[model samples]
Target: KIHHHHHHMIEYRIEEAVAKYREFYEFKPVRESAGIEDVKSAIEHTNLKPFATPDDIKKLCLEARENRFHGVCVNPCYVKLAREELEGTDVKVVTVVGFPLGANETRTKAHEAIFAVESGADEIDMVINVGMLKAKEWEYVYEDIRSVVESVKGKVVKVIIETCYLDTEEKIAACVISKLAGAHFVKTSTGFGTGGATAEDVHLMKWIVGDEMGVKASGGIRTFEDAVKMIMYGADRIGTSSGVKIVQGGEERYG
Candidate 1:
């Protein structure tokens, strides 16, 4: 005989998952530092378009300094120029290695990381090799990340997993590989992917990484609501060109 109680228990399990998700959504504390002051600064600092010229980069740096971003993420080629432009400011220069795609040879990525650091970048964001992960080549992926970490010595390294391309299991695996490889953070997406970070992904990442490891949520985070949701789900850093608008809640404040 079918028991109605059994059906109720199954429904309860579904309810439990929903409740857990709701709790995750409620996790972000009110940011005391994220007031109008921060918003004004962020808006004035963020450039609407990506800088392609040296003068454009210089303008962005000065604006960044004036507004006080945590750091400026730029291409590796501009590391030296950004470093020079922001020399006297508290702004830290960050460059990407492996970049929008993480498919470079391990040695090449390591060399790029070392060179960026030497050129005065304060941090490096390296994309993880998705091909190695898809092939279940965990050793290759781990070593690839380790080489960059080792090459950077003590500088900060954020590993971009391009989470939009990964499934739940692969996401967990990538998080494990990143932490074991000595990455400072496990980031979601490259903003060039079909999708970007989600609250569920961020929560799962934080769960896997635990308290010791940090998580960065990037890609498609363009509004205050999106940024707030990511933070609630355990993102320690938010990466976006919309940093200004996000902090300002859509209000335009130009420098």
Candidate 2:
């Protein structure tokens, strides 16, 4: 029988991440230099709205450049714009595939990934087959991620498990399959799921994936308070549409 044990909620921190990054930079303004650099380096600046236009994407890239973010996560269609607009910058162009929902066939998803990379995406965040995962078809889930991984062998590939619908065992199973399939990262949620990333989810994922792979905490990460909590819990990357607000040290939140 599968043993069921309930663990206490994780203790999350805001200022702790501030202090952690301060370790990286001995001296600087907290928001502009230390704190911002810490959070900014981990952030995947996102604009994934279904109705988002070219102008909206351009603005997001502008924010990424201005803020020195790690990536600009957008729909696959905008990857080129991000790559072009970024011109000369270190921020990666992160695009999504089988997004929001991961019900697509493996060939189609792989094809999409290939195209996105060819079009200039630096990283690909693909949704796992949630239906197959919930159905306990572990092999299918493993292969599904594998196809995308193989398609973009050189690019960073993040597997989105859409955690809100999964139980602990399922979450663990998803991470195991993703790592086995050679995923670069295992992400918590798609932000369009029933719920988004949580401190508990980030910690659990990091615990299992270890220091070898990345744990990107996306979905519902609004304020610096929320973003830092995930980072302190062991998130190597933060995916959010509200990146500007979080890095600027502002409380005004959206996404």
Candidate 3:
């Protein structure tokens, strides 16, 4: 027998999302020029290396200040340091939850979000439970995201779908679930995944989410032209370790 216990709840949530969202729908058009400040505003300077030292994070914050990148994305342990360093500046402090893998329990992810926010993180980019999404467990996946979204009422919650692992339909499903969960953004990758963002994926994501949410293209975006191409395809934000190079003009790259 099949269970329909969660069917009513899911339907109601979807309708609620559509109702509360459409009124605020306004497409984010691509910018005309990929100038330094223009590209800088869209970029979240990142440093998520496993062995990154405090000096490295300090350097990241310095670069963020010098270039005026949108924010600094760091691992949980360094959230506080990044927060302090970027204080009194427009650069936001973004931290990840469930990180490269999204296999943590719902409660665990939510708690991680709570602590990160308490530590002064302005944004939370959490990895979705890709394994459950692949299993077609829509209800479970939705709840997993909602729990974390619910915990961070004021801070931005970006759901990283890790697009590299999903097929076309699966990617669509991830975006839909993220929208219904009330996430502020649907991020393309973790940069720790098998592959990174693609123009096709960014275009498909924007088409799916429309103006209800932001599309952040991350991972393997290493150059100014790369960032511009993503924006042209509808990415509202760019996440990369090469924010400096992208804005100013890389030997190679990290994210």
What local lDDT score does residue 229 receive in model 2, on the 0 to 100 scale? 80
Candidate 1 lDDT by residue in tens digits, 1-255: 243443344345434544554465333432333444444332213232344778877877866775577777778888899989988777878778897889999999999999999899898889999988877676678889999999998998989999988876677778877877889988887887788889888878887676788787888888877766677677777777776566567344322
Whole-model Cα lDDT per candidate? Answer: 0.74, 0.82, 0.87
Q: Write the per-residue lDDT of candidate 2 for residues 1-255, one digit (tens) a residue.
A: 121111111111212332443454232111222255678899999999999999999999999898888989989888888899998888899999999899999999999999999999989999999988888666677778999999999889999999999987677778877877899999999988789998788877776676999999999998888887888777889999998878655433321
lDDT of 3 at 50: 98
Better of 1 and 3 by lDDT: 3
Q: How high a TM-score does candidate 2 get?
A: 0.84
Error of 1 at 99 (Å): 1.2
RMSD of each: 9.5, 9.4, 5.3
Model 2 alpha-carbon miss at residue 2, Å: 26
Backbone clash count for every predicted candidate, in the order shown: 0, 0, 0
Q: Which pairs clash in the backbone of model 1?
A: none
Model 3 lDDT tens row, 1-255 = 132566456555545544544454344444564555667899899999999999999999999999878899999999999989988998999999999999999999999999999999999999999999898787889989999999998789999999999987678778888988899999999999899999888877887787778999999999988998888878889999998777656223322
For candidate 2, give the lDDT of residue 141. Answer: 79
User: What TM-score number comes out for model 3?
Assistant: 0.87
